Every structure is written in C-alpha cells, then in structure tokens.
Amino acid sequence: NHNPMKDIEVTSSPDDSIGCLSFSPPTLPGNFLIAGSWANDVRCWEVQDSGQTIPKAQQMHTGPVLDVCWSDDGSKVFTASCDKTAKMWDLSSNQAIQIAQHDAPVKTIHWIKAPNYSCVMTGSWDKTLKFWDTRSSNPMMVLQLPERCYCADVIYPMAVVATAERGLIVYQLENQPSEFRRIESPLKHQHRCVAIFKDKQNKPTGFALGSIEGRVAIHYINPPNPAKDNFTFKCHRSNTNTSAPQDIYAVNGIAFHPVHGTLATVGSDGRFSFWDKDARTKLKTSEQLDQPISACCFNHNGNIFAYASSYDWSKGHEFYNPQKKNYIFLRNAAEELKPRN
Amino acid sequence: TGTTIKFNPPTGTDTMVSTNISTKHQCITAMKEYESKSLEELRLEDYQANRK
C-alpha cells in the first residue's frame, strides 16, 4: 500500500511533503540525493550501490524549499525557498550563505556553467528571472517574465521557463542569457513542470511540458514538420471499459533518462509512468500509491530513479494529514526505460 | 486567500478511442474559484494562515 512497487526506501525521510529532488553530478564520486521539503529543510543522503542509504547532512530555510540543484563540480548545493531567498550550501564545511533575493517565493533554481561565465538562475513568483555570481549582492542579470514563474530547466546552451497564464519562453545562454523564443503554449491549462531533452548528438533540442490537466507536450525547438513533430499525449488519468467519468490528475514532475532519452512522469494520481517520445509509447505505469507522487529525478547515469510520495495540495487543505508518513523511493529503472528492439 | 472554498472536482468532456466522454478534473486549481493560483501558491497561503 505505501510502497506498492516494493522499491528501496530512503532512511530518515523528510518530516513534511517533499517538494524537490536532485541527484549529484558525475563530477562527484558516488551518488548523493538532495531533497527540500515543506518543513523548510534541505537534506542530503548518500545512496550506496547496495541500495542502502545514509543521512549525511541537513540545512534550514525559514520557508518551504521549492527547488534545489547542484554546482557542476559537485561541491555546492543551491536551494530556493518560499522565504524569498536562495542559499549556496558547501557540503565539505556544511555552511550555507544567501546568494539571491526576490520579492516573492523563489520557485526554480539552476546552475549555468557556460564557456565564459557561471551563475545561478532563480525564477520567482515576483515575475523576474535573476542570475547570480554567488559572490556579489547585486544580480549579474535581471530579466522580466510575463507572469509568475512555475517551472524551469537548463541544459547549456538552452533554458526554458514556463509561467502562469500559459507563458512559455526559451532562452539561449551563449555569452550572456537572452530571450530566444516566446512560444504559443501547446497546453491549454496551468503549466506545472518542464524538462529539456537532447537530440541524438547530445545537444539540447526540445523540452517536455506537463500541465494540471493530465497532459504532456513534446516540443522540438526547430523540427522539420512542427505540425507533426510536436504533439501532446494524455497521462495520469483513471482507466477497464468503464463508463464512469474519467478522473484527470496533475502531472507533477518530468525527467529524462540521461542515457536512453526516454522520460518518466509522476502525477497527482500516485503513479509514475515511463514513456518513449520517439516511438510515442508508454513503457510502464506503476501501481497506485496511497498519496500523490510529488517529485522525481534520475541520478547521473540513470541507474537510480527517485520519486517522492507526498501530498501535493491537489485537493486543498482539507485532504492534508499532517502526518501520514512521507517517502522517497529508489528504483533501478534502467532496463525499464530502454527503448524497445 | 487559502483553500477555504470546499474542493469540488469540476466536470468537463474529452475524447477517447473517437467518442466524447465525461471527465472529472481532480485538481482544485481547475475550479473557476482557484484557477488564478498554483498548487504551491495556495499551499503557502494555507501554511501562512495555519490552515493545515
């Protein structure tokens, strides 16, 4: 019931709903998992190849942690919070300092390692996108967004941001970030998650985008036949040849397998599904968990799939049980995500 | 602010294989009363009111 897939449980899970997960880069030996929660904390575990998990370190914001990411050398963890700030967390010394400030919660945070610069990107509900050298108190760069930031992704030289009211913007990152293309959104309801994918030559080439309406869009930046190469598919809906109305759930997270180019989605229905967007097929759907799956991600080589079982407020405050127990599950889904043939 | 209005999943229609089918949107921000905010925005509002 709580772990229907019989996957590996992370020991000492966060005390409140898990909002974000992020695995260590390949510059770092081993695998380290970061998670931020709605109890305002950030946690770090070492995942051992045996599957066994060791809680390593912890930090605190003063409001819920909405996103986390790593520096490219694996030495820093960056954290974004509803307290309107972002911190840089040096694991070796376990110290964290403020590196960013917004006028509203900071929904997204990303590390940009470019040939001629490095910075932190923060996207906020104050309708700005800001960039930080982690040294100065002034942002290196401030861009206005068309609405509140809801999700973002970065793979140099591409970034993609989605905002409230179907805003969707692609940025290029060479030399200095700049707006590259304002996209008429292929989805008609609230944007929720976004993930960049790469072509067969490893260059970022498009993104997948999830909404609250059981739907995911596949969007190539520059395909030969956009009518035909871009598409949307339905997911995280109830099923059986029943005639009851279909229940539609929010898509909460998307992540691409770093080796296979396939993708996973996790939903408000307490299920994860694996997909091949080239074959346009569903490779797997999980058993249903007893609460929503709130976040997910892969480790650097894709051998570990991490997903978080947490309430996501999709039915409002009346359905929050301040605890039912929260979970992070690890599953070795490498062969389950391998394309077929 | 917050989620004081009771959750009621809005109804709509969609397609399946082609036949129109009835749907229930199981996400509170699908109601007209909650559509201008995100799940996370609403949760922060409930947290700041101690409405947990």
Partner: peptide, 13 residues
Amino acid sequence: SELDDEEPMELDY
C-alpha cells in the same frame, strides 16, 4: 526483472 507491455500513447487527434 520482467517488462510490461508497451502501449501506444493516447495522442491528441
């Protein structure tokens, strides 16, 4: 380690 049946996505139109 067995594999589920690969189903086609439910595309739109």
